[PDB]
Every structure is written in C-alpha cells, then in structure tokens.
Design a protein around this ligand. Structure first.
Ligand SMILES: *[C@@H]1O[C@H](CO)[C@@H](O[C@@H]2O[C@H](CO)[C@@H](O)[C@H](O)[C@H]2NC(C)=O)[C@H](O)[C@H]1NC(C)=O
Ligand SMILES: C[C@@H](O)CN1CCN(CC(=O)O)CCN(CC(=O)O)CCN(CC(=O)O)CC1
Ligand SMILES: C[C@@H](O)CN1CCN(CC(=O)O)CCN(CC(=O)O)CCN(CC(=O)O)CC1
Ligand SMILES: C[C@@H](O)CN1CCN(CC(=O)O)CCN(CC(=O)O)CCN(CC(=O)O)CC1
Ligand SMILES: *[C@@H]1O[C@H](CO)[C@@H](O)[C@H](O)[C@H]1NC(C)=O
Ligand SMILES: *[C@@H]1O[C@H](CO)[C@@H](O)[C@H](O)[C@H]1NC(C)=O
Ligand SMILES: [Gd]
Ligand SMILES: [Gd]
Ligand SMILES: [Gd]
Length: 479
C-alpha cells in the first residue's frame, strides 16, 4: 500500500511538514526532527503495541516540534503547544504565513527552501516536483505556482464556508473533468477528495498522501468506467500518478446532449427529501453537460437554482415559476461570458502593462489596507488570467476560474481578515458570488491613510503607493 511510501520518504515527509508549519526554522533544526521521527518509526517496528506508536503521525510530528528544546519560543508558536492535539493542529495551521518576503531569496535542502517559501502547497505536489525536479542538464516553477493557487483557493473556501461548499466545488470539478462517470460513483469520489482536503489544508502531510492515494485508487479502479485520457497515469508510480490525473485534460463526453430538475412536478418533494444530494445531483448533471464553463459559475448557477426553488415551492402551482430555470441559467451564463469579452477587449486596447496598471489602481482603490507587495502580486496573478486563455474557445471557462483565485489570495487562506467592511463582506458571505461582489465595489469610502515620501515590480509598487497616497482622486486622474 501507500503505507510503504510514507516510511520510505519519512526523511522528506517530516522535512515538508516541519518546513511548512515553522517556515522561520533552519535546516540544522530540520535534521534534528528528521532523526527523532526516523528513530521513533524504528521503535514502532521494534514493538507493534508501543504506546507512542498507537498515536497518529502528525500529532507525533507537532508534539516533537513543541518538545524540541526552546523551538516554540525562538519561532513564536508556544501558544500552539499549550493546546489539545486537535486545537494544536488548527493552531499550527494558523501559524503558516503566505506573505514570505521576510525570508531570503533562495533534495533535503530544496524541499526545505520550497516548503518554507510555499507553506500551503499539498505534500503530493512537492514530492512530485522533487521527482519532476531530479533533472540532469539545465521552467517547472510555472506548474508549482499554479498548483499552490488552487490548493490555497480551496483551503481558503474550506476555512470560511466550512466543509459543504468544498463538496459542491469538487462535484462541479470532477463531473466537468469526468463526464463519463456515474453520480453514485462520483459523489463517493467527492466525499474522498473533500475528506482529503480536511487533512491537506490542516497540514497533515502523512494523511495528505494516504487520502490522496485513496482518491487515485478510487479513480483507477473504475478507469474505463470513468475516463479514457488518464490510461497511462494509473501505470505511473506514487505520487506522479496523483498529479498526472489532476494535470490531465477533461474526458471526451458521452453521446447524450437534461430537464428533470425543471420539467418534473415533484421537484420540491425531491428537494425537501434530501436537499444537499438533490442539489449535488443538479451540479453533477449540469456540470457534465457544460465542460466549457467555469467552476465559480457552476456554483453561481446551483446557488441561483437553490434561490429559485426557495421562492417557488411556497406558491400555488409550484412548477409554473421554476419551468424556465434552464432559460434563467443560459441568461445569467451568457451575460457572464459576454462580460468576460468586455474585459478581453480592454486587454487588446491596452496590453499586459496597460491593464496591469488599471487593476492595481482598482484592486488598491477597493482594498487599500492591504500591503503594496500583496496588491502588486494579485495584479500579476489577475493579468495572467488574461495573458493566456483570453482569445480562444472556453475563454470564459478560464478567466473566471483563474480570476477567482486572485480574490482567495486577497481574502486570505488561513485567517478571517479585516481589510475593510465591504471587501470583508465579499469574502465572509458567499464563495460563488465574491468575484461579482468584488466587481461591484467602489473606492473604500472609510480609509485613513498613513504617510509615505524588478523594474516591473518597482513600477507597480510606485503605482500602488501613489494610489494609496492620492486615494481621494479617481481612476482616470492617477493613470
Ligand atoms: C516572541 O517570543 C519572544 C520570547 O518569548 C517574546 O519576547 C518576550 O515578550 C514578552 C512580552 O511581550 C516579555 O515579557 C519578555 O521579556 C520577552 N522576551 C524576550 C526574550 O524578548 C515576543 O513577545 C514574542 N513575539 C510575539 C509577536 O509574540
Ligand atoms: C483553457 C486552457 O486552459 C487550455 N489549456 C491551455 C494550457 N494551459 C494553460 C491554462 O492552464 O490556462 C496550461 C497546461 N494545462 C494546465 C492544466 O489545465 O492542467 C494542461 C492542459 N489543459 C487542461 C485543462 O485545461 O484542463 C488544457 C490546455
Ligand atoms: C484540473 C486540475 O488542474 C485541478 N485544478 C488545479 C489547479 N489548476 C491549474 C491549471 O488549471 O493549470 C487551476 C484550476 N482550474 C483552472 C482551469 O482549469 O482553467 C479551475 C479549477 N479546476 C477544475 C478543473 O478544471 O479540473 C480544479 C483545480
Ligand atoms: C435575488 C438575487 O439577489 C439572488 N442572488 C443572486 C446573486 N446575488 C446578488 C445580490 O446579492 O443581489 C449575490 C449572491 N448573494 C449575495 C447576497 O445577497 O448577500 C447570496 C445569495 N442570495 C441570497 C439573497 O440575498 O436572497 C441570492 C443570490
Ligand atoms: C472564520 O469564520 C467562520 C464562520 O464565521 C468560522 O467557521 C471559522 O472558524 C473562522 N475562522 C477563524 C476564526 O479562524
Ligand atoms: C444554452 O446556450 C448553449 C450555447 O449556445 C446552447 O447550445 C444551448 O442549447 C442553450 N440552452 C438552452 C436551454 O437554451
Ligand atoms: Gd519520552
Ligand atoms: Gd485546472
Ligand atoms: Gd489548461
């Protein structure tokens, strides 16, 4: 099983866990833990029933980190060690910092200097971009920076909206990626992936391999009863196989080109029967029939539909009103697609930099409490969405998926943030409707500024500071 892999890479698996949780730590300190864990494992191979060996492999990791001589004082995390094992795991999670400018620029030494610079990335990923980093003659950064962004974006969602929206996300994700799948199958594969994100986000490295491998087992076991593009991925070795399936393209779709949720007369009953399944089923069926849409849109629609029935199943002749839920989608969808086209012309009528400067002003205008480097970063992640996939088929399926990531960054990953009462309302309200929430924000009315007085980053920093300074002015002035 995977159980072998975890013991084989224990050196790495410990390094990552530590490095992420405590980014401020040295490599000297990493070796100290590595030995304790290695020796600990051998004692668990020296006795099957040893009291320390009935313990879970992360609440061992964090107990040693805390036990380690004056380490919590030297990296300000003593308050995490003064908590019960569960509260301590959550604390250690809150301890992980995303804005890592306080560190210097730049296997075991690499995994240290990645993990502590990329703390929220999943273990499977890092270990894959070690095997997929073991080169011979002198790129890959592109892949890692992307895989962090979606993992942070979900572990964001999980924190703020609990363990319900993450399901809906991964129904829309997997149903769109694997249309040939069946509901009862996929819904199980989701309550695996959802239960995986519980441990991967919290930072439980060891589980994030177990539950990740369990998920890839769950796919490959129904290989040609799910997909036909990941055939050579299931022949790859842990955890390449993990990131192979994830990195692959969406399945070719069946011969079927639905209206049970609209046409039927007992929709309220099937909704009242078991809501979250009924909705889960609606997101399943609508997703697999729309592989040219965004993940945020496939939730916006499901939410809108949940709102439609909520207003419908409380009136004489229910169906009459939810008859054209189908048409109400093709409306709100085509509006959103055309709205992407309106900003993909602003791109042509400015270019990378020209648009970059537009957003930075805007992004700062609405959220000027943020850091200049924080606001700068988003401005490049935002323009990356338009850089690629904003002049081709499914240009909406991307720019929406990709722009949504930059608001998760803004709203924070592992903290309930206080930016301004409006940006806060866009973050801590609804996951689906945060992009349109942000799109509808004017200048931060309530803001009291402080004093002030590469080249591309330098330019941006200047603009963001210039905007923060002259915040009482308008978009066209500052340009
Ligand atoms: C990080 O840890 C250090 C050491 O525990 C903290 O420094 C102490 O601060 C308290 C009150 O702020 C004083 O009573 C101690 O005398 C300080 N000791 C030393 C050696 O400085 C520091 O406050 C912690 N930083 C944060 C942000 O919590
Ligand atoms: C719509 C475009 O996204 C099409 N896209 C353009 C190339 N992308 C750029 C990007 O990610 O926007 C980088 C490589 N890409 C990354 C990935 O998806 O895993 C793999 C191939 N993808 C699979 C997919 O899209 O699901 C389709 C090709
Ligand atoms: C497919 C995997 O790559 C999973 N993926 C990992 C991160 N990706 C990296 C990248 O896309 O290059 C970006 C996210 N993605 C953007 C897009 O696909 O255009 C939307 C959400 N997807 C849904 C899906 O398309 O399966 C799940 C997240
Ligand atoms: C009637 C429409 O407004 C339905 N609406 C469509 C999109 N909205 C736009 C908006 O908020 O007017 C944003 C989503 N919305 C945010 C919010 O309302 O705070 C959460 C869900 N709401 C719940 C409600 O408030 O009835 C219904 C969704
Ligand atoms: C953030 O708020 C949500 C809901 O209000 C809550 O579930 C979550 O635990 C909070 N996270 C914190 C305080 O870190
Ligand atoms: C929604 O729009 C798509 C794309 O043009 C179209 O193929 C589909 O038939 C439309 N659906 C409805 C119900 O009008
Ligand atoms: Gd002991
Ligand atoms: Gd993706
Ligand atoms: Gd792609």
């Amino acid at each position: 099983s995977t159980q072998k892999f975890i013991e084989d890479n224990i050196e790495y698996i410990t390094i990552i866990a530590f490095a992420q949780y405590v980014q401020e730590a040295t490599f000297e300190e990493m070796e100290k833990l590595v030995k304790d864990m290695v020796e600990y494992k051998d004692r668990c191979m020296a006795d099957k029933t040893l009291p320390e060996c009935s313990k879970l492999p992360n609440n061992v990791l964090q107990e040693k980190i805390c036990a380690m001589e004056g380490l919590p004082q030297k990296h300000n995390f003593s308050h995490c060690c003064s908590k019960v094992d569960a509260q301590r795991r959550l604390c250690f999670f809150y301890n992980k910092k995303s804005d890592v400018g306080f560190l210097p620029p730049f296997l075991n030494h690499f995994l240290y200097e990645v993990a502590r610079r990329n703390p929220f990335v999943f273990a499977p990923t890092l270990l894959t971009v070690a095997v997929h980093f073991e080169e011979v003659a002198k790129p890959v950064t592109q892949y890692l920076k992307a895989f962090s962004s979606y993992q942070k974006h979900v572990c964001g969602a999980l924190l703020k909206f609990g363990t319900k929206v993450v399901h809906f996300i991964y129904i829309a994700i997997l149903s769109q990626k694997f249309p040939k799948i069946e509901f009862k199958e996929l819904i199980s594969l989701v309550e695996d992936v959802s239960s995986n994100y519980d441990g991967c986000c919290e930072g439980d490295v060891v589980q994030c391999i177990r539950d990740t491998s369990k998920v890839m087992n769950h796919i490959c076991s129904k290989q040609d009863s799910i997909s036909s593009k990941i055939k050579e991925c299931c022949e790859k070795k842990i955890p390449e196989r993990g990131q192979c399936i994830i990195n692959s393209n969406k399945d070719d779709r069946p011969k079927d080109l639905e209206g049970k949720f609209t046409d039927s007369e007992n929709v309220c009953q099937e909704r009242d029967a078991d809501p979250d399944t009924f909705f889960a089923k609606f997101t399943f069926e609508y997703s697999r029939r729309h592989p040219d849409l965004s993940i945020p849109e496939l939730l916006r629609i499901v939410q809108i539909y949940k709102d439609l029935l909520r207003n419908c199943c409380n009136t004489e002749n229910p169906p009459g009103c939810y008859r054209y839920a189908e048409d109400k989608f093709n409306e709100t969808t085509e509006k959103s697609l055309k709205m992407v086209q309106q900003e993909c012309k602003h791109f042509q009528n400015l270019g990378k930099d020209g648009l970059k400067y537009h957003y930075l002003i805007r992004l700062t205008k609405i959220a000027p409490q943020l850091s200049t480097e924080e606001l700068v970063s988003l401005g490049e992640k935002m323009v990356t969405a338009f850089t690629t996939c904003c002049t081709l088929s499914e240009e909406f399926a991307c720019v929406d998926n990709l722009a949504d990531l930059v608001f998760g960054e803004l709203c924070g990953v592992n903290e309930n943030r206080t930016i301004n009462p409006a940006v806060d309302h866009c973050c801590k309200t609804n996951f689906a409707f945060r992009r349109p929430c942000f799109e509808s924000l004017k200048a931060d009315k309530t803001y009291v500024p402080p004093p002030f007085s590469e080249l591309q980053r330098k330019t941006d920093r200047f603009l963001v500071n210039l905007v923060k300074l002259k915040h009482e002015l308008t978009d066209e002035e500052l340009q």
